[PDB]
């Protein structure tokens, strides 16, 4: 490592990034140019195997500003990952390996980023996950760093403060956060909207804080060496010039999110000693130096595999990598009336007992969400994570637990506060990771806490979000079947659970929870079908019994999962959905009109009152539902 | 003010709160008891008129921990607001004036609170609103304080850090935040999940920080006097004992959210010199002292009205209180092809020119959202607010602008980042305030930024949320008509706007935007009706022309607002919805099955690519839509 080679390496990264953006006529060149010197130096510190991006003890690199994707892709290509020069030439084009923000389908990308702040919380999560991995497997086997590059947008977002709060509490001395302090945001100078003492902020949260010139190779290297020895999470505040190297665009907010322009790039190449009339150029010295990551990484992983072979942890690691979901004996809730928060809590305990990598927690609502994993201890030594009142960071942290390699995480809160974590849930869905969301207190059945605490629209949100299963079990048996599906599924799942006691169901007549909806009651020449989920199924059973006593044949359908029902074939749906179909849910769920002629829901916000009073107010009684079905 | 009277006053508040919770068998007594000494002293500082809760220059009191509602209600009753002893006896009961968390329908409640963190951001917003009011009306007329009581849950939430960041930047020396530091959260000791240096955190954000014993009347009074003279926003860290006065429950996390119990209350009353066998008791000295707020408040408001009469601001204040929406000449966009972000930006400028209280901003996306109010300056002197990368705090701050008394605020971001602010949007909806949400970049038409930046499920969320209008205009004319409705409406509205250019529509055939959906094309004996919103309307017009050329009569319906369409009578809906109805939207909008037989939408996440390539990929072409409609 020396100034001449580092300058060539940094400029190679700058011009690959600039050329990529220019060819796409789209993207973000300013930050890549501002960060290129830092990444060049960081390449000498990062421990990774480009030919095995799943090596468990690799350093984890996170670009929280996913807009700087061109720089990440340049680095992955140069380092020997499975990303070609042609792929770089396809930046931002339909179906390419180089989308505008990074996606985990591109090998080498640790986690999908883009929405600001997320990546900082994800990096904290990788650092917590690594501490838990060290607890399970030993410091001989888990000893790596977590490097996160972030910008002003990330640090203004509330989620960054939440996650960094937890990083200081948990003494995450494996976490190195590099802040690109370039004085610019979209609306112009950062001072228009931000003037915090950033050093003091992070020291208040238990970080060590270093401040450098992000274009001085010696200062970057010295900061990284110091950060690696820190006994605290470490922040490097790196002062940079946005679009560094790009002449008239240096320092310009306009360089953030639009191509630099052909003439600017020609001039920049000229000033750097590069031929201005060629694009996507990789000079020899830089080519060889960056690609030596291949040989170095193979040797690092080989040494690590030798430690694993000597360890007493081999069988444990194999169990963590190969969980057996089939063996699990779940509780038998047949015939047992219970609130589904309580059946679910018992299931969480069975899962934690059977699966060494299953863990999670609540955003300060454990006693209400019923998520305590009894006698399994507190993080880091145990399994129960105390996220605090930090729903959003909790979900982003657990997205990283799910990506780490050995964990099956769950995030818990009240269903109304799913809205605080929805942007991170969406990243789980985008990536199709195995991360389970536990949402209790699902309806106006909450009662006295009132309309701020009574979900209405959240079921619609989760059902509309792609790549999610939204389970709303009517009893414990459905709750178990939902978990069996969720563990085998290729996408994340939410569990929407009651505060209040529900009535145990009788056994399925036709179909089961695996079909999303199934028959609880089937009548020849049914005139009506009552379709419900969760707490409304019993109302429909009772109403169907009354309708039958009045001379109307009825089907009753339980629909624990709308998304699974949508996948069933027409023959199956047609067997269930007979006559006039009435959907019944304590929610404003207009999506039910996909399957129902009429929907009996809630169109307003709720009310503060006793649960039974609130349900009556909103029409959830046999007499009212039967009157509605009989249109009079 | 002396120790004997203050102790009696504080204990009066404690036992009203405890008795209320006990009678309801529901609620949160611990914080009321912990905060009662602070509120007793604060009652001597607060400037307010119990008989006119709308007095513009009143101090604004915000309980961010809405769970402490019993204490607020006790104080409002004692101070002479329109809240009776009987109302206190109806705490948490259906349809009472004393719901479990505070609602603005209870006179004296400044803003609805409950979801943690919100109230802190709302209080920052009242302080910013007051600074703008001072800019408009003068320091002779606007000089009041904003007091916020908060707890651990509030300060762990990201939104608190975001809002307090802005408070320090804007030198909000009218803002006094009182933090109830009681060492407890729901999961037990606060140290399980939080160990920040809170003084350092707030000093990093430009606050003055005082630290007191929250049970020492002299220290509370001295802190308040110092805070009132601060040249910075001020934090008082008040160390308290949860359930102070309640013997065996002192310091217990169990006192947070359940009744204290009859025996605990008897003992607490005995120790305080109160008769344990009576409930809802107000001793004479305390009764008289608390109710003197009536006479004092009338005199304070009278003095203020005399200043208003001497001011040169009388006509301005009257215009702000009585905006004339009818007079406004909006731009004429007839026949003009435009992106609806651009028509909307022109409308925002016309509104800001015509309405002295209309203002707002973006979360660091002004240039992309097209929200700059040209030549109207930056806050505080002007109208453009630079919220930074703080979507959630922006919305909570603007909820407070909307409650202040003289402002019409708008919050702007990309539609995908509506998810960061949704919990605060929900409070706007709950309160039915006039707060406008501007969401640009509404679909896969975003293009190259890819699936993290392409909305799919957000339209469903906003349509499902009660008390919101969700406008998705297809052209500038619809955009204007939507604003005319939104300004006259009794609920908040969102505007869902395109990045990309849309085609101007021809004039309505039957109905208009006021009906939510209306006919653009009507054919006798229509076989198909194509229903769309926003950017998909033109596709449907073109597809209907092709279907007509192939011998199929078609209606085409534009649906700029689903919620308004839901309110139309059956005769109107039946005229529009002829034959087989196909809904077409670049969204996963299953709610369209309320009106449509078939829905042609998007069921997956998007793709990074050029807009035209992405729309083709997802099926938005005439040939594909016609093939779908012809079922082959």
UniProtKB/TrEMBL annotation, chains A, B:
Could you give the cofactor binding note from the entry?
A: Binds 1 thiamine pyrophosphate per subunit. During the reaction, the substrate forms a covalent intermediate with the cofactor. Binds 1 Mg(2+) ion per subunit. Can also utilize other divalent metal cations, such as Ca(2+), Mn(2+) and Co(2+).
Q: Which GO terms describe its cellular component?
A: cytosol
PROSITE patterns linked: TRANSKETOLASE_1, TRANSKETOLASE_2
Family recorded in the similarity comment: Belongs to the transketolase family.
Name of the protein this chain belongs to: Transketolase
**Might you give the EC number(s) for this enzyme?**
2.2.1.1
GO molecular function annotations of the record? metal ion binding; transketolase activity
- SMART domains tied to this protein: Transket_pyr
Binding partners and assembly: Homodimer.
Site entry: Important for catalytic activity: 28, 256
Organism name: Campylobacter jejuni subsp. jejuni serotype O:2 (strain ATCC 700819 / NCTC 11168)
Q: Which residues bind Ca(2+)?
A: 152, 182, 184
Q: Which InterPro entries match?
A: THDP-binding, Transketo_C/PFOR_II, Transketolase-like_C_2, Transketolase-like_Pyr-bd, Transketolase_bac-like, Transketolase_BS, Transketolase_CS, Transketolase_fam
What is the role of the protein in this entry? Catalyzes the transfer of a two-carbon ketol group from a ketose donor to an aldose acceptor, via a covalent intermediate with the cofactor thiamine pyrophosphate.
> What cofactor does this chain's UniProt record say it requires?
thiamine diphosphate; Mn(2+); Mg(2+); Ca(2+)
Recorded hits in PANTHER family, A to Z, give: TRANSKETOLASE, TRANSKETOLASE 1-RELATED
Q: Which reaction does it catalyse?
A: D-sedoheptulose 7-phosphate + D-glyceraldehyde 3-phosphate = aldehydo-D-ribose 5-phosphate + D-xylulose 5-phosphate
Pfam families given for it?
Transket_pyr, Transketolase_C_1, Transketolase_N
Residue positions binding Mg(2+):
152, 182, 184
Record-listed substrate binding positions: 28, 256, 341, 368, 441, 449, 453, 499
Positions binding thiamine diphosphate in this chain are: 67, 114-116, 153, 182, 256, 417
- Domain spans labelled Transketolase-like pyrimidine-binding: 338-504
GO biological process, any = pentose-phosphate shunt
């Amino acid at each position: 490592m020396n100034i001449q080679i580092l300058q060539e390496q940094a400029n190679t990264l700058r011009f690959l990034s600039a050329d990529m953006v220019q060819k796409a006529n789209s993207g973000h060149p300013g930050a890549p140019l501002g960060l290129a010197d830092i990444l060049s130096v960081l390449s000498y510190h990062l421990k990774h195997n480009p030919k095995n991006p799943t090596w468990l003890n690799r350093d984890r690199l996170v670009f929280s500003g996913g807009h700087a994707s061109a720089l990440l892709y340049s680095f992955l290509h140069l380092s020997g990952y499975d990303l070609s020069l042609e792929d770089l030439k396809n930046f931002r084009q339909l179906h390419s390996k180089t989308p505008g923000h990074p996606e985990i389908s591109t090998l080498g990308v640790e986690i999908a980023t883009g929405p600001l702040g997320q990546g900082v919380a994800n990096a904290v999560g990788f650092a917590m996950a690594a501490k838990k991995a060290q607890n399970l497997l030993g410091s001989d086997l888990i000893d790596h760093k977590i490097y996160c590059l972030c910008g002003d947008g990330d640090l203004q977002e509330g989620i960054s403060y939440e996650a960094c709060s937890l990083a200081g509490l948990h003494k995450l001395d494996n976490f190195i956060l590099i802040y690109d302090s370039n004085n610019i945001s979209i609306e112009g100078d950062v001072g228009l909207a931000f003037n915090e003492n950033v050093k003091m902020r992070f020291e208040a949260q238990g970080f060590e804080v270093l401040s450098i010139n992000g274009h001085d190779y010696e200062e970057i290297n010295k900061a990284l060496e110091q950060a690696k020895k820190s006994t605290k999470p470490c922040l490097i505040i790196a002062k940079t010039t946005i679009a560094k190297g790009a002449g008239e665009l240096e320092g310009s907010h306009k360089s953030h999110g639009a191509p630099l322009g052909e003439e600017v790039i020609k001039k920049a190449k000229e000033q750097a000693g590069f031929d201005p009339n060629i694009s996507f150029h990789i000079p020899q010295a830089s080519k060889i130096r960056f690609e030596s990551a291949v040989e170095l990484g193979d040797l690092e992983e080989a040494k690590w595999k030798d430690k694993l072979e000597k360890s007493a942890k081999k069988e444990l690691l194999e169990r963590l990598l190969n969980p057996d979901f089939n063996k699990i004996a779940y509780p038998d809730f047949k015939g047992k009336d219970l609130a589904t928060r309580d059946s679910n809590g018992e299931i969480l305990n069975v899962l934690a007992k059977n699966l060494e990598g299953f863990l999670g927690g609540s955003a300060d609502l454990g006693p209400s969400n019923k998520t305590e994993l009894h006698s399994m201890g507190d993080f880091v030594e145990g399994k129960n994570i105390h996220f605090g009142i930090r729903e959003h960071a909790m979900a982003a942290i657990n997205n990283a637990f799910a990506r780490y390699g050995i964990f099956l995480p769950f995030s818990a809160t009240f269903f109304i506060f799913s809205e605080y974590l929805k942007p991170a849930a969406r990243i789980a869905a985008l990536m199709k990771i195995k991360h389970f969301f536990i949402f209790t207190h699902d309806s106006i059945g909450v009662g006295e806490d009132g309309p701020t605490h009574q979900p209405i629209e959240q079921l619609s949100t989760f059902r509309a979000m792609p790549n999610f299963l939204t389970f709303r079990p009517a009893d414990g048996v459905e709750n178990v079947k939902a978990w069996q599906i969720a563990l085998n599924a290729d996408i994340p799942s939410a569990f929407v659970l009651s505060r209040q006691k529900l009535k145990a169901l009788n056994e399925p007549v036709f179909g089961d929870v695996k079909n999303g909806a199934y028959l609880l009651k089937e009548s020849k020449e049914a005139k009506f079908t009552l379709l419900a989920s969760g707490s409304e199924v019993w109302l429909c059973l009772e109403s169907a019994n009354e309708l039958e006593k009045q001379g109307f044949a009825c089907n009753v359908v339980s629909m624990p999962c709308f998304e699974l029902f949508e996948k069933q074939d027409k023959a199956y749906q047609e067997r269930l959905l007979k006559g006039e179909v009435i959907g019944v849910e304590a929610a404003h769920s207009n999506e039910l009109y996909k399957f129902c002629h009429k929907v009996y829901g809630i169109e307003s916000f709720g009310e503060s009152g006793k649960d039974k009073d609130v349900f009556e107010r909103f029409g959830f009684s046999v007499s009212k539902l039967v009157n509605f079905i009989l249109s009079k």
